[PDB]
RNA sequence: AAAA
């Protein structure tokens, strides 16, 4: 009969409320979720959907009371809505976490409840979740509890509370290309890994740009039709000794030939130390079978795999569980909305770390990739998420990009980190260091 | 000495504090800027730079009182700092605008001042980001600052720590010099075609055959050797040569655009593609085609969109160079520069506009991320980003919902326009920005 | 300016 209620303020960032609720739900009998109603005339959207997700993923059920506020920018209206809608039952403890919502919502909800329950029969408590030091702080009470390593969340819950659905991703055991280059993926992977370990990445990248991309990536679907491909080849042969084809046949490094010859016999782009040039007979379907997957993987997907493989090891040493706290090829969508793609995701406690990968050394493209990773992690994991971009650029460029796209939030730790070509061989350690600090 | 003090909480968004400060400045004798100190051990950065920029651009002089907080997440540390550092003079009114700062800063600065001062007039206010209203707690007023408070691009970028601001006016646009005496005729001819719903046909012709002919090796159009070899390669592919498509399948309205350039700047020799002779030096080739190609390759679209809104912004009494402009560039200290095609300021909301003739989903999406982040960096968290592309209507609606981020407003802060909007892009922007 |  001594009811204890926890009050949470539902803003546009559902994560903090989830963390606080997960930590305190066991000690409370009722939960009041104060949220915003929708009034387009005042440019105010509703946070009800967030409140619903919070109730669902925290299993509040019938203990949850939803309190709607008409205007979250007006004190008068907030106070009035409170006196009219706030639960009237007799409580012995009212706990308010005022981390979320508008500043006016926080001030007037706090003072309203402090007065309504000033009776010493009722204990009033105020809490705040600090995003900078991952701790729950109580008002007037030195008691400070770090929730950084105590509250955990899985990828599905994180995306769900942020209104994302149809979440799909891959495991190391379920990598798509492992099925496409069956019986050969492992050799292909090791050959590439050995090269990266031998500081050969920059050479591989340069070769991929020229002569590889000039040959296999010059048109929209040249590798889909034998005709166009043979034409592209014929055209290139006109440039003679400067042709990309000659460069491929005469100046391709041995380590690259080793990687190329690690592919299955029916999926190789070369016939000996020569480019395989389809004859007139080759069927368009035959061509695609032999070159599509191979070219796509070599055009970059390999880097994603390599970095993932380097990180899995270290993350297993830690408590992270694949599928829940880390994965590759993440895709999801908001209802009736276009899907997104994130190469690698990692969750440290309740912080999302998104990793985008590019083999590019060019400043312009890498810059754009940075904007992308920053926006995506914010959309799917919240405003306190970290974004990491792994590029094929040198240190000076990486440092410049970090300064270029840096945005201030009040924290001393960076939320946008850029790695470069010199970090590839030891990328796993570099990631472990940046993520787990 | 009936002194009246205004208290502001300095978060990482200085714009609302500047707006509230500019509105209430002439009513208060003292200003207490409460900001955070830096402490790496608690991952707490300092907002002192924003407080400095607020004092500078509000011209507070010695009437500004800096009040540092050591820990903006600790209620006891906040109260102790306030009790020891808040000015002790006799005030008849203490006005606290609690719009900025962390929630703990807001709660405990509000209750500390409400206890300390409230038969003395205590007042709390909050600037609504959604409806542009300064709401009072005790007087229960709600004054709209949407059309009252104005800010220029220099002040806006400076409070957000950006410096070395440069841009171009309508009458200082660069290409006007590249085509002296002829820029008008060139832009009017292009404008006439886009207003005639020829934009989609124009961009198709720019992708092929225009970019096949003039967009190859770096400096291709500045080296006769590179360019003549290139054309000779193209002529080899006679059946589908872009040179044949240029001469035989170019529509009439594009010939009128090409013929609008001066004689020494035309890509065409009569009704054919101009192929340079062997007497043509590197200087001759570059003088004829370099500026014409770069302008037709996309730069023309920046000028077109800018010219379609200039008259509509002057009708609304906005001042060029202060509230709108082209080719904005700036930077942070010792930091790389940024480039924004067009900027517009409605009241005190920044509207950044990124332009591209591209119809590709992937490239337009990357430009969407860029303009979203840039207007956030230089204009704050409540700025609007507009991306004008060449995609069809269905691709713009997808990209709009693709990059939409929920901040609590019903009005979208990321707007995407496409090829269907070019003919009336002036009205499409005016309605989106002001209505 | 709805985990500064
Ligand atoms: Mn009243
Ligand atoms: Mn599914
Ligand atoms: Mn990638
Ligand atoms: Mn542009």
Automatic annotation (TrEMBL), chain A:
Positions annotated to bind Mn(2+) 5: 304, 343, 357
Entry binding sites for Mn(2+) 4:
304, 341, 343
- According to UniProt, the name of this protein is Card1 CARF domain-containing protein
- Identify the residues that bind Mn(2+) 2: 154, 324
| One Pfam family recorded for the sequence | CARF_Card1
Q: Per UniProt, which keywords does this protein have?
A: Metal-binding
Domain Card1 CARF: from-to ranges? 5-122
Locate the residues binding Mn(2+) 3.
166, 168
Which residues participate in Mn(2+) 1 binding? 76, 142
Q: What is the lineage of its organism?
A: Bacteria, Bacillati, Bacillota, Clostridia, Thermoanaerobacterales
Quote the record's binding site residues for Mn(2+) 6: 343, 357
Membrane-spanning residues: none
Taxonomy, superkingdom: Bacteria
- Give the Gene Ontology MF terms in alphabetical order: metal ion binding; nucleic acid binding
């Amino acid at each position: 009969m001594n009811e204890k209620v926890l009050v949470l303020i539902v803003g546009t960032n559902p994560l903090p409320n989830y963390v606080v609720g997960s930590h305190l739900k066991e000690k409370y009998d009722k939960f009041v979720l104060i949220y915003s109603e929708k009034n387009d005339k005042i440019n105010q959207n509703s946070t009800y959907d967030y409140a619903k997700k919070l109730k669902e993923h925290l299993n509040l059920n019938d203990k949850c009371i939803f309190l709607p506020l008409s205007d979250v920018s007006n004190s008068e209206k907030i106070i009035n809505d409170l006196r009219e809608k706030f639960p009237s039952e007799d409580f012995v403890e009212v706990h308010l976490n005022y981390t979320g919502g508008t500043k006016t919502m926080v001030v007037h909800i706090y003072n309203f409840l402090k007065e309504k329950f000033k009776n010493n029969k009722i204990k009033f408590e105020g809490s705040y979740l600090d995003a900078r030091d991952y701790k729950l702080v109580y008002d007037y009470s030195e008691e400070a509890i770090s929730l950084k390593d105590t509250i955990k969340i899985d990828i599905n819950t994180l995306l769900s509370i942020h209104l994302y659905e149809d979440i799909h991703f891959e495991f190391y055991d379920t990598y798509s290309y492992k099925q496409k280059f069956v019986d050969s993926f492992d050799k292909i992977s090791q050959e590439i890994e050995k090269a990266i370990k031998d500081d050969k990445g920059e050479d591989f990248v340069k070769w991929l740009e020229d002569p590889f991309r000039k040959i296999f990536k010059g048109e929209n679907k040249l590798l889909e039709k034998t005709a166009k491909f043979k034409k592209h080849i014929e055209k290139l042969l006109k440039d003679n000794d400067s042709s990309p084809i000659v460069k491929f046949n005469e100046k391709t490094p041995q380590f690259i030939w080793d990687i190329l010859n690690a592919f299955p016999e029916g999926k190789k782009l070369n016939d000996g130390q020569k480019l395989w040039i389809p004859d007139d007979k080759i069927t368009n379907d035959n061509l695609s079978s032999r070159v599509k997957d191979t070219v796509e993987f070599l055009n970059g997907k390999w880097f994603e795999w390599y970095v993932y493989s380097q990180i899995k090891s270290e993350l297993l040493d830690r408590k992270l569980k694949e599928g829940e706290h880390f994965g590759i090829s993440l895709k999801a969508q908001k209802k009736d909305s276009p899907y997104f793609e994130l190469d690698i995701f990692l969750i440290n406690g309740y912080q999302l770390i998104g990793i985008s990968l590019t083999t590019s050394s060019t400043r312009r493209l890498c810059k754009l990739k940075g904007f992308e990773v920053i926006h995506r992690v914010r959309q799917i994991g919240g405003d306190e998420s970290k974004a990491i971009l792994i590029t094929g650029m040198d240190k000076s460029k990486t440092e410049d990009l970090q300064k270029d796209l840096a945005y201030e939030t009040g924290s001393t730790q960076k939320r946008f980190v850029v790695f470069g070509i010199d970090d590839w061989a030891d990328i796993g350690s570099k990631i472990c260091e940046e993520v787990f600090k």
